[PDB]
Amino acid sequence: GIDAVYPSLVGTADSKAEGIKNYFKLSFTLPEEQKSRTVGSEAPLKDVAQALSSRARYELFTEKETANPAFNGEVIKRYKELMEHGEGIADILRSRLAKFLNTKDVGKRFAQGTEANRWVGGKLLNIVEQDGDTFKYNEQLLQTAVLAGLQWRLTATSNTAIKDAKDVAAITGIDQALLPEGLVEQFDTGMTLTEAVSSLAQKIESYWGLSRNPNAPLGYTKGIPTAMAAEILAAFVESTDVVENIVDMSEIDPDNKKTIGLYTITELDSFDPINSFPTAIEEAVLVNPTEKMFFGDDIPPVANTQLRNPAVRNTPEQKAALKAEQATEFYVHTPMVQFYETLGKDRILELMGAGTLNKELLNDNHAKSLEGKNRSVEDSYNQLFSVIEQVRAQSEDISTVPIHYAYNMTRVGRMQMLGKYNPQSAKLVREAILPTKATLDLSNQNNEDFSAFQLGLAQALDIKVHTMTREVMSDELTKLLEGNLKPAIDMMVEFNTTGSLPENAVDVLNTALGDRKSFVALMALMEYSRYLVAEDKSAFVTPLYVEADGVTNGPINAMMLMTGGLFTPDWIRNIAKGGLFIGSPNKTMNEHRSTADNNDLYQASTNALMESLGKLRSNYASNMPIQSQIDSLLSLMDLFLPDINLGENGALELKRGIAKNPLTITIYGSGARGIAGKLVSSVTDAIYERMSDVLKARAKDPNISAAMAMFGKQAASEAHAEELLARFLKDMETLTSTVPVKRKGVLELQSTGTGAKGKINPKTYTIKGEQLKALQENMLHFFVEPLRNGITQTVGESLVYSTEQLQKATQIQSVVLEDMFKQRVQEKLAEKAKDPTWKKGDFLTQKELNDIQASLNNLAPMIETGSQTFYIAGSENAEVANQVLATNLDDRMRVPMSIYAPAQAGVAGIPFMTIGTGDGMMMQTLSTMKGAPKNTLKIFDGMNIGLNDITDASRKANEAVYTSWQGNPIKNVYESYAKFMKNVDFSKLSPEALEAIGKSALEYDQRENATVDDIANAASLIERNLRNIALGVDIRHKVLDKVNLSIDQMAAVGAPYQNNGKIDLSNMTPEQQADELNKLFREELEARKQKVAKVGREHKASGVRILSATAIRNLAKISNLPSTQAATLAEIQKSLAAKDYKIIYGTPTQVAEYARQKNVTELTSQEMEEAQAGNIYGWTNFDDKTIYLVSPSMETLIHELVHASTFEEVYSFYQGNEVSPTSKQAIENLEGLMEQFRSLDISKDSPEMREAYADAIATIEGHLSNGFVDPAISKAAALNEFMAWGLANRALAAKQKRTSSLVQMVKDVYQAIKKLIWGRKQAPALGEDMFSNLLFNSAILMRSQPTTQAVAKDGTLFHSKAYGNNERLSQLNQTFDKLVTDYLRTDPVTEVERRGNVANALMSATRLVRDVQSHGFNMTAQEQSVFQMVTAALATEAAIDPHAMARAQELYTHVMKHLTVEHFMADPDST
Amino acid sequence: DIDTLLTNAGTQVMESLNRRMAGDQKATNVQDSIDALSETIMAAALKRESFYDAVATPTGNFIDRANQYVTDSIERLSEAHLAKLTAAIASEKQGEIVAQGVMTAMNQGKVWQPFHDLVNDIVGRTKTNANVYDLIKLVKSQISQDRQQFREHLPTVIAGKFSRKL
DNA sequence: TCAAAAGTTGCGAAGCAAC
């Protein structure tokens, strides 16, 4: 076979011999079938020459009945020039071979018998021929190789991927948050060495049509094609087809000695005929081409493996979704392609981009950023019109040719189109090729088919169609169609009749569209204008679509799949914002946003951000310079970054589904420092854009001042613009000259040189270096930290806990796999060292590599969910080889060796599970479900549906969401972690491996001297935690399936899905629905647990007993306690009886049932973990003085009697009331001991004592860092928790303990309580039991009035038809909150007469506000509130500063000089 | 423009006050003045919350919201054919039938027969085993049926005869 | 940060030195 064909190759085919060897004959075998048509071709270049000479000739060679109609006679002439060009390189390669054979007598050395074909650069020589003194190429192998180069030349750039931030930083050595701008853009044209050689190598191997022997070294089955590929690229670069750019990296930073290189390939002209049918060669030399376009009955095949993950196969359920998606037919919209080509490529760039580019009036850093925007549009435009040329040649009518695309699973289970520019990715092609179609009756404007038509138009024109009813949408849409969009429609109508555009087409659209500019907004104008001129509106056919976008699909999916524990009323309200409604059948998002709540998850997080930020600012009241630094940072944000909610809403960027919002980024485990740089990059980018406006304004008028050029649009006068400029200069100087430093838990300011000075120079203004670093330090400490606290409050604390355990479990397992994999290749290589045949430089064979990979199957490296498979650690690293694969003949470019080996997971575990099971499963379920919608384009979290069936396909979208919510990512992970720990051994790991996994399992203080026993014990604890979480999630999903629910997550039409429950939860408060859900949760716990096992007046409806006051006299001495403490009970209980304290006790079922009858909030302490232990604790209601006990005893009754009395002293002292001097000292002493409690060392204490301290310190700091509660209430709660920790841990810290500081702390806190209870009278001696090991275990309930900012910010975004839906008034209120509301005192408001000067102005303004409304100016509810609040702010300011109204007076007199009665008269000639 | 100059002259005044509250309020004795301002904002914040939840209805009507609250409150304590008839009366499109009045239309459709059965039980003419709460949920159910068909569906029928949007 | 990876030459025939 192999020896039979081309048997003249130099070398001996024998495996082991002392002579020279030809390793090509052993590395590659001969496939039994046919893969390439050039295997038997003596001259492949000339054989295909007669194949591409005529249409008839091309028929026989390809063995097809008919050829592509695009392969006509016009492109025949083009291919002759290109292939003749491909004949000149073959001579260049031959010339280069001769030079190598003579340089340094390398070829002469072969005469003696040197093994020159086994060198790093000599792998190319393995296929050379013998001709005597000299050598020559094998013609068949050489001529076939250049065919792969020609095909690679045409379509290389169409398949290259996009470089990510990490890789760009990796090849640069500097983080992408600090590198200078502009060098990132250079990736657009150039590609690195490995990208170019690897892509070309694959084509050469495929064209040869040979398989790989599994028993051959990896240095020959993978190096021979690479050596050939490097030769072709070197030939091309000297032939001017490829240009090589060498970048010296020492200029930007001297320490970077690296010298990277970029390769760029020359591009053909746009009108070149080769663009019509560029894949003639590929479909001629192959049998199953991969580069193709499918027309008619052609169907793409189904992929067998994931994207860039050969070790993972596609599940049969996954393969079913691939078949359905690839069967959907697309069509080209003829009326839209005419509009694009008539406008022109240059006009498109100006309209979509930043207009015409000129370096004279553009900032240096701003100009280079716009290059990426222009590059993407130009490439997408060229690609779209190259496809149209091929389609137009297939039929007379272009709009009747189906087009099929290809999909494939990615590494996270998401379907992805194959190709860089496709309808799924490029937004330009999305408006030309669509799968949707519809037929509507628009003869009447009051029909039901006209409402669907208006829904598509309104959504495409940037209208929140999912937050208003179907009637408000029509009212708002009609205003646009007759207002600003009127001039644009008139031009569109003219185009639809004569096909021409005005000379100012670009300018007109910019004025009309405004900030609503998008590629889809141009389609809406075309469809509406096409409808007006239509003569028959009863059978209108349009491809317009409506997108069923999800509402915050990221956080919502993670909150519903990775949350455990009892249900909470706060969770119920928060989950309502995502589209889950409990006890409200047939409810939609439109009704919820109009009548219930208009705040979303993004807005809720921002509201909590300012609540915590105000608390932090108040703590530094004694440090004025610190406060001024906070204001400077916030003031700079307002000028340039009014909003922080970023995202993929840009119109000149490809859609990849990557989430960049701060809320979802923080959930995905991103570091605090990383997001600080991202926020700074947005502010600096906004500053540069303002500089371009200064230069642009200077050209128009060379006399305007700097202040008027920058802040002209927001200045009421010339003096107002000076204040804004002066304020901006001071803000930027302070931030870049002073930084905050963290000292022992308190911040401090230090000087770090000089910041920006008083010189603008807008042409060359930039911020970098020390100034840029100082900017991020202020941002991290003053804005990022409060953001984390606010995010956790909304998404729930339990969700954060579930994410931390998931990251640790996946990180530990990844390091072990990586270290073990590296420990077996070294053993195998050392084993081969005693084999004379083996030579250093090669690698293990394919069979050997698989055996090592298959040896880790017992470690469970893959996670199975029943329908999806995940491989987190899989990557194509290169450090495992540390060798050189191959190189050029002249030793110019060296290609390293890359192997597919496991790597460290890092923080990728959290986004893998959420995306893979949350959103990835929904789309897979939607495609394969019964009666799945047809002719739709689902991208990642949305879908495009035709106007005919908007209300039916949207209902099934919500059904898939419900189905995907029944999964359990934690349970799947735990099933792999448990198996991993069964067959693991930490005593055989490398010393560096133990350090890597010690950073996750252990703490900071325990990291040092970490014994291998401590590492094993710590890793076992994480497995236990994962078991409980998977149990809690499973039970919660069972309870929710038994109640009626309405799901409206992924919808904008108003067609929800009902889960057909059986328990009615309607007509109940959200606080009431939690109790019912908790009742079913507890019944499930006891049902499983039992399976494994196989005095006072009594209430009537429940078996609880009520023990009121004046009924505890007998029980005073029943406990027979010593008389020293017996007298205390008489005094303590006497005070309690004066306040009418009542006692209620019973079994857990009885005490919980009684609360539901009387509407009583319960705070019983028990969870799944506590259920196994079997401990239940009651609670105390401080508002009505009621004590609740669960399964009480005589011992615990006495403890609660003194617990309630002690807490009264703590509460009264913090409320400002006078306290006894004996009790005052005790609380004061306890406060002092509290300040030392959070600054202790625990690394030398018992492991169990660490948990007691860690849990106590978590809740203590949480109370002090709360800004929405009364300070008196928060302070009392923190001290009460301090007392509980000391008494609870006394029993076990009084023995087997050393003289540790923490152990000593327990004794001091215990002694302080003794004096407080006993007062000035004699107390029991030290070390004696207080009340038979008295403990504090019952929670305390307290409430207080909310703050002013809490109620003002709640109704800011209220909007409704009957309440008022003025969008502009909503924005005005938002800016009012920042200036005034956010700076009010956090204390709750009071009611005093408040006589004075300012109050007179406020009182007078209130009366004048009412008179205006009753004297001709009727206002709605929304407009009345804004007018009332704004006027109050202007009234108090004018009362303090008499000159504040000087400017407003000037504008008033001018208005009064042009006002007439007829201005307010609608019909001036009325009767 | 004059309107854009007026709003800019307003935020300038607000920004002047913002630079006053951000300073040392206690030292510059503006603490009492700001407290008066916060009272006005608090009072106006609660008033706008009362108007909301008072129109928490798809139709945004005072009466419609009140009826829903009473209907739900009765179902907590208590622990078809006629509806289709009233829908045809308000959906008539003949043009000449609607010109004869509504008394004639009701008689033709025999709407009075389902109505007579319910009233007889309430008065006591016909004995029945239904409790009070079952009958109250019946009378209040038919009242909402008339309002939905006549105050909401009838205007859509009239506007549907025009080929435009007046 | 949710994703493919990734310096360039001289001597000498592997791998360190130099930048």
Residue A558: closest CA among A784, A806, A772: A806
Is the CB of A938 less than 7 A from some atom of nucleic acid strand C?
A: no
**Cα gap A1084→A1368, rounded to integer Å:** 51
Amino acid at A292: K
User: Å between A833 CA and C18 C1'?
Assistant: 32
A217 and A209 Cβ atoms separated by less than 8 Å: no
Phi, psi values for residue A1043, rounded to 5°: -125, 160
Q: What angle do CA A59, A61, A62 make, to 5 degrees?
A: 70
In three-state secondary structure terms, A860 is: coil
A273 and A74 Cβ atoms separated by less than 8 Å: yes
Checking each nucleotide's C1' against the CA of A877, the nearest proves to be C5
* CB-based burial label for A1454 (10 Å; 0-12, 13-18, 19+): exposed
Tokens for B99? 């010109």
- Where do we find the tokens 């923190």? A1278
Number of helices followed by number of strands (H, E) in chain A:
54, 36
User: Which B positions 85-114 lie with beta carbon below 8 A of chain A?
Assistant: none
Tokens for A101? 């054979």
Q: How many CB atoms lie under 10 A from the CB of residue A163?
A: 17
In three-state secondary structure terms, A649 is: coil
* CB-based burial label for A715 (10 Å; 0-12, 13-18, 19+): buried
Query: CB contact, 8 Å: A1429 with chain B?
Result: yes
**Cα gap A316→A868, rounded to integer Å:** 9
Tokens for A938? 């689902």
Amino acid at A1353: K
**Who among residues 137-196 of A has its Cβ near strand C, under 7 Å?**
160-161, 163-164, 166-167, 170-171, 191-195
Number of helices followed by number of strands (H, E) in chain B:
8, 0
**Cα gap A873→A866, rounded to integer Å:** 20
Q: How was this structure determined?
A: cryo-EM
Could you tell me the sign of the dihedral formed by the alpha carbons of A722, A724, A729, A730, in that order?
A: positive
User: Which A positions 685-744 lie with beta carbon below 8 A of chain B?
Assistant: 714-717, 720
Quick one: closest CA in B to A1348, which residue? B42
A1270 and A1345 Cβ atoms separated by less than 8 Å: yes
Contacts 24+ apart (CB under 8 A), A323-327: A324/A927, A324/A928, A324/A932, A325/A407, A325/A415, A325/A927, A326/A299, A326/A300, A326/A302, A326/A404, A326/A405, A326/A406, A326/A407, A327/A299, A327/A404
Beta bridge partners of A1045: A582
- A221 contacts: CB under 8 Å, gap ≥ 6: A27, A28, A212, A213, A846
A413 and A923 Cβ atoms separated by less than 8 Å: no
Is the CB of A410 less than 7 A from some atom of nucleic acid strand C?
A: yes
Q: How many CB atoms lie under 10 A from the CB of residue A1389?
A: 19
Contact A624 B24 (CB under 8 A): yes
- Where do we find the tokens 């401990």? A1175
Give, in order, the Cα–Cα distances in Å from A126 to each of A2, A10, A30, A214.
Answer: 15, 8, 18, 19
Quick one: closest CA in B to A1360, which residue? B60
Q: Which residues of A675-700 are buried (b: 16+ CB within 10 A; e: fewer)?
A: bbbbbbeebbeebbbbbbbbbbbeee
DSSP label at residue A191:
B
Amino acid at B17: L
User: Which A positions 622-641 lie with beta carbon below 8 A of chain B?
Assistant: 624, 627, 631
Smallest Cβ–Cβ distance between B41 and the set A1352, A1391, A1448 belongs to A1352
Maximum distance among all Cα pairs of chain B, rounded to whole angstroms: 83
Residues of chain B contacting A1448 with CB distance shorter than 8 Å: 6, 9-10, 13
**Cα gap A1446→A1453, rounded to integer Å:** 12
A307 and A406 Cβ atoms separated by less than 8 Å: no
Residue A587: closest CA among A1049, A940, A969, A1230: A1049
**Cα gap A159→A203, rounded to integer Å:** 13
Tokens for A898? 């890359």
Contact A1067 B61 (CB under 8 A): no
**Cα gap A247→A261, rounded to integer Å:** 6
Amino acid at A522: L
Give, in order, the Cα–Cα distances in Å from A27 to each of A38, A126, A832, A1253.
Answer: 20, 11, 19, 64
Contact A1379 B11 (CB under 8 A): yes
Amino acid at A602: Y
Give the number of beta-carbon pairs within 8 Å between A and B.
Answer: 169
**Cα gap A678→A289, rounded to integer Å:** 43
Residue A1230: closest CA among A1259, A1265, A1206: A1206
Q: How many CB atoms lie under 10 A from the CB of residue A1209?
A: 17
Which stretch of DSSP H or E encloses residue A211?
strand A211-212
Query: CB contact, 8 Å: A1354 with chain B?
Result: yes
**Cα gap A807→A791, rounded to integer Å:** 19
Which stretch of DSSP H or E encloses residue A1436?
helix A1421-1440
* CB-based burial label for A915 (10 Å; 0-12, 13-18, 19+): buried
Q: How many residues does chain A have?
A: 1471
**Cα gap A1354→A1373, rounded to integer Å:** 12
**Who among residues 1099-1158 of A has its Cβ near strand C, under 7 Å?**
none
**Cα gap A1199→A584, rounded to integer Å:** 45
Count of alpha carbons within 13 Å of B165, Cβ hemisphere only?
Answer: 13
**Who among residues 212-271 of A has its Cβ near strand C, under 7 Å?**
246, 257-261
User: Å between A138 CA and C10 C1'?
Assistant: 31
Annotated binding-site members of A for Mg(2+): 549, 941
**Who among residues 94-113 of A has its Cβ near strand C, under 7 Å?**
104, 106
User: Which B positions 139-158 lie with beta carbon below 8 A of chain A?
Assistant: 156
Contacts 24+ apart (CB under 8 A), A294-303: A294/A403, A294/A404, A294/A405, A295/A391, A295/A394, A295/A401, A295/A402, A295/A403, A295/A404, A296/A401, A296/A402, A298/A404, A299/A326, A299/A327, A299/A404, A300/A326, A300/A404, A300/A405, A300/A406, A302/A326, A303/A408, A303/A409
Query: CB contact, 8 Å: A1451 with chain B?
Result: yes
**Cα gap A905→A1044, rounded to integer Å:** 41
Which stretch of DSSP H or E encloses residue A1046?
strand A1045-1047
Amino acid at B162: F
**Cα gap A437→A934, rounded to integer Å:** 11
Which stretch of DSSP H or E encloses residue A779?
helix A770-779
Q: How many CB atoms lie under 10 A from the CB of residue A837?
A: 9
Å between A797 CA and nearest CA of chain B: 29
Strand C nucleotides within 7 Å of a protein CB: 1-15, 19
Rg from Cα positions in chain A: 38
Q: What angle do CA A955, A957, A963 make, to 5 degrees?
A: 110
Give, in order, the Cα–Cα distances in Å from A301 to each of A287, A924, A926.
Answer: 14, 18, 21
Mutate: best of A447, A711, A1067, partner B, most B CBs <10 A? A1067
Contact B44 A1384 (CB under 8 A): no
In three-state secondary structure terms, A870 is: strand
Smallest Cβ–Cβ distance between A1380 and the set B18, B30, B44 belongs to B18
Give, in order, the Cα–Cα distances in Å from A1462 to each of A34, A406, A566, A833.
Answer: 90, 67, 66, 104
Residues of chain B contacting A715 with CB distance shorter than 8 Å: 8
Query: CB contact, 8 Å: B166 with chain A?
Result: no
User: Which B positions 36-55 lie with beta carbon below 8 A of chain A?
Assistant: 36-42, 44-49, 51-52, 55
Parallel, antiparallel or unpaired: strands A1186-1190 and A1142-1146: parallel
Q: How far is CA A860 from the centre of its chain?
A: 28
- A900 contacts: CB under 8 Å, gap ≥ 6: A310, A311, A874, A875, A876
Residue A818: closest CA among A808, A806, A810: A810
Instruction: Kindly give the residue spans of alpha helices, DSSP state H, lying in A461-520.
Output: 470-481, 486-498, 505-513
**Cα gap B30→A1440, rounded to integer Å:** 10
Amino acid at A1008: E
User: Å between A256 CA and C8 C1'?
Assistant: 13
Query: CB contact, 8 Å: B12 with chain A?
Result: yes
Phi, psi values for residue A397, rounded to 5°: -100, 120
> Resolution for this model in angstroms, one decimal place?
2.9
Amino acid at A1194: M
Tokens for A410? 């990615």
Tokens for A1170? 């506590």
Residue A379: closest CA among A354, A417, A348: A348
**Cα gap A589→A595, rounded to integer Å:** 10
Query: CB contact, 8 Å: B1 with chain A?
Result: no
Give, in order, the Cα–Cα distances in Å from A1438 to each of A117, A1405, B3, B16, B22.
Answer: 92, 11, 21, 10, 18
Contact B35 A1389 (CB under 8 A): yes
- Listing DSSP states for A277-332 in one string gives STTHHHHHHBSS-SS--EETT------SEETTEEEEEPPHHHHHHHHHHHT--BEE
**Who among residues 909-928 of A has its Cβ near strand C, under 7 Å?**
911-912, 915
Query: CB contact, 8 Å: B163 with chain A?
Result: yes
Count of alpha carbons within 13 Å of A1011, Cβ hemisphere only?
Answer: 3
User: Å between A462 CA and C19 C1'?
Assistant: 55
Q: Which residues of A473-494 are buried (b: 16+ CB within 10 A; e: fewer)?
A: bbebbeebbeeebeebbebbee
Instruction: Give me the sheet containing A545-547, strands edge to edge.
Output: A545-547, A943-946, A937-938
Phi, psi values for residue A893, rounded to 5°: -120, 130
Query: CB contact, 8 Å: B117 with chain A?
Result: no
